[PDB]
Every structure is written in structure tokens, then in C-alpha cells.
Design a protein around this ligand. Structure first.
Ligand code: NDP
Ligand code: LDT
Length: 313
């Protein structure tokens, strides 16, 4: 398979990227260096992950070393929920740029549709534990994202964790200037997302699949939860193809015309996860993997469920 997918801004995006949520700051610089050395050209970042400075050290070193040129990298970050007001978006983007050692981002996403009260805390809570909303709305946050394109800070803008009605809301915005290029959503065999994916794809929006391995390192994991990497049925497909279960889980979204962003800080796994362009899942394999859907989510958060714009039900 071809390495890149065409976006509706006319740029090409690598279909495989390195995830960085939970990558410890003392490990992520090496992880990104190794990733670039073994062929990765897309890194998925976010301010809320608290490691963009260290990601940036790696990017800058590999550019300085001339392992890669900047035009060949595709760096993605995301606007956190406490920065949805008009007067905060540009500074949030610029902080990310400064940390990542970048003059521009290839793609900047609204991380979640929900705006929260600005301040130091990423999840401001009331005394009963509910997130404190801001009275920002999706559409005005989108207008702020559009300004970043028009200032040269970002090449593409998109959304993340937007449901069907929220994507539609963005597409139907009065005076819409730039369509979202990407909707980044959780997607794997236990949360196959057929409905949302077809809607977005039909609208020319590329979907990126996050937590493709089921995020085994998620901090809220419980022992009872299903485990993709350990599922007998997925292991059998991997065995048949002489690949690892992770490699199957990465190739699966690729064949659905998705971008996929597995995270690792383990050098051997960073390389393993890139070796997914030399085998094909059959249509029967694809349908079989799709059949494992159970509407099971890594990423959800009880404290945010009453926000007017919380995306999931
Ligand atoms: N937009 C959003 O709201 C969200 C975005 N994301 C993005 O998506 C990325 C990926 O999702 P994430 O939730 O991190 O989880 P993943 O599904 O990518 O799973 C990461 C875990 O899998 C392990 N792992 C990686 N490769 C292998 C392998 N070959 N064999 C076995 N285990 C392996 C990692 O271990 P180790 O690192 O120890 O090797 C880590 O524990 C995030 O890092 C982030 O960039 C994720 C959630 C939400
Ligand atoms: O969010 C990520 O990329 C990965 O996860 C996170 C990454 C972080 F660095 C900090 C918190 C999260 C959480 S708890 N994310 C879930 C979450 C946050 C906000 C809302 Br609205 C709903 C929700 F489900």
C-alpha cells in the first residue's frame, strides 16, 4: 500500500503515524528518533499529553541531522478543551509550535468538541466533580481554527471525537471557509465505527483511528475489559498471515482507507508496527475483524458527560 492519503486541503498525509499519549517524557525523544529512523513520517501529538517539548527535541534533532526534511514530516497536534475561546486559540497553537520546534503544523485538531473553563487545570471541576464548561460553541471554535490556516500557522485543520451531528454542524456552518480535513476518532475491532466512518468519508473527511491496539496502557484499564492484543480470534488471523496481532490491528484500519496512529515507546515495537505495508488482509479477514464490534470505548470520561457537547452516548 501507498504510504499517504490525499486530504481535502490538497496535502498528503502518511497513513501510519506514531502515537505519543502516555509516552513518558524521558522516553519519548528516543521513541520519536527511532520512529523517524525506521520510516515514520507522521507523529500524533497534543498539548494535553504534556510531552510536546520532548517530542520536539527529537523532531529538531532529526531535521538537524538531515535524516528527513521538514516537508517530508507530517506533525499533528490538538487544541485542548480549556482553550476553545477566540482569544486563546492562537496562543495555544503557538505554545504547541514552540514546544515541537516547528514553524507550522501539518494538521491541528479540535481535541474534543467540549470547551472547558480556561485556567491552569486541564479538567476544571465543580465541587461535585462535574467539568466546568465554557460557553463556547463548536462553530466559533472552528472559525478560530480557520484563522490559524489564514495566518500560516497550520496547513490543515480538523476535529477529533466529533459525532455525526457535530461533524454535520461543522459542515453546515454559515460562512464555512475550510472544511475539516480529518476527524480523529477511536477505532478498532471492538469499536468499528462503521456509521461515523462512512458519513465522514462520504463528506471527503479523512478518518484517523486512535487507540488501534485498544490502549492497553490506558490509566483506567481494568482486568475484566476485553483485550484486542490477546483475543484468540485476532491472534489466529495474525498467525495465518505470519504477522503479529499488533500488525493485523494496524493493517485493518489502513485497508478501510483510515489513517492509524499506534503508540509505542519500545524500539522493537515501533519498528514492528511500521512493517505493515507488505501484506494484505482478505475481504473475509476484514469482515471477520469487523464482526468483533462490541461498541467498547477506551476513551470516555464520566466527569464530562453532562457537558452540552459531550459526544458519546
Ligand atoms: N484524539 C484523541 O482523543 C485521542 C488520541 N489518541 C492518539 O492515538 C495514539 C494511540 O492510542 P493509545 O490510546 O496510545 O493506544 P494504542 O492502541 O496505540 O496502544 C498503545 C499500547 O500498546 C502497546 N503496544 C504498541 N505496539 C505494540 C506491539 N507491537 N505489541 C504489543 N503491544 C504494543 C504500547 O506499549 P509500549 O509503548 O510499552 O511499547 C502501549 O501500551 C495515542 O498515543 C494518541 O497519540 C489516543 C486516544 C485519544
Ligand atoms: O484525550 C486523549 O487524547 C487521551 O486521553 C487523555 C489524555 C490526557 F493527556 C489527559 C486526559 C485524557 C482523557 S481522560 N481523555 C478522555 C476524555 C477527555 C475529554 C473528554 Br470531553 C472526554 C474524554 F473521554
Amino acid at each position: 500500500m501507498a504510504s499517504r492519503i490525499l486530504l481535502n486541503n490538497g496535502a498528503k498525509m502518511p497513513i501510519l503515524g506514531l502515537g505519543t499519549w502516555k509516552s513518558p517524557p524521558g522516553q519519548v525523544t528516543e521513541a520519536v528518533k527511532v520512529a523517524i529512523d525506521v520510516g515514520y513520517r507522521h507523529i500524533d501529538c497534543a498539548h494535553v499529553y504534556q510531552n510536546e517539548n520532548e517530542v520536539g527535541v527529537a523532531i529538531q534533532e532529526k531535521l538537524r541531522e538531515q535524516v528527513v526534511k521538514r516537508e517530508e514530516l507530517f506533525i499533528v497536534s490538538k487544541l485542548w478543551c480549556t482553550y476553545h475561546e477566540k482569544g486563546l486559540v492562537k496562543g495555544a497553537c503557538q505554545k504547541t509550535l514552540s514546544d515541537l520546534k516547528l514553524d507550522y503544523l501539518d494538521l491541528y485538531l479540535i481535541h474534543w468538541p467540549t470547551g472547558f473553563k480556561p485556567g491552569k487545570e486541564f479538567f476544571p471541576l465543580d465541587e461535585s466533580g462535574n467539568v466546568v464548561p465554557s460557553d463556547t460553541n463548536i462553530l466559533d471554535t472552528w472559525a478560530a481554527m480557520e484563522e490559524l490556516v489564514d495566518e500560516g500557522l497550520v496547513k490543515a485543520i480538523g476535529i477529533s471525537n466529533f459525532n455525526h451531528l457535530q461533524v454535520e454542524m461543522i459542515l453546515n456552518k454559515p460562512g464555512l471557509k475550510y472544511k475539516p480535513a480529518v476527524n480523529q476518532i477511536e477505532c478498532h475491532p471492538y469499536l468499528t465505527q462503521e456509521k461515523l466512518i462512512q458519513y465522514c468519508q462520504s463528506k471527503g473527511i479523512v478518518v484517523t483511528a486512535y487507540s488501534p491496539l485498544g490502549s492497553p496502557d490506558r490509566p483506567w484499564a481494568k482486568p475484566e475489559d476485553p483485550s484486542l492484543l490477546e483475543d484468540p480470534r485476532i491472534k489466529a488471523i495474525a498467525a495465518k498471515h505470519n504477522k503479529t496481532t499488533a500488525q493485523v490491528l494496524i493493517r485493518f484500519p489502513m485497508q478501510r482507507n483510515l489513517v492509524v496512529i499506534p503508540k509505542s515507546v519500545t524500539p522493537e515495537r515501533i519498528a514492528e508496527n511500521f512493517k505493515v505495508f507488505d501484506f494484505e488482509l482478505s475481504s473475509q479477514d476484514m469482515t471477520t475483524l469487523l464482526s468483533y464490534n462490541r461498541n467498547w470505548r477506551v476513551c470516555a470520561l464520566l466527569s464530562c458527560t453532562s457537558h452540552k457537547d459531550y459526544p458519546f452516548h
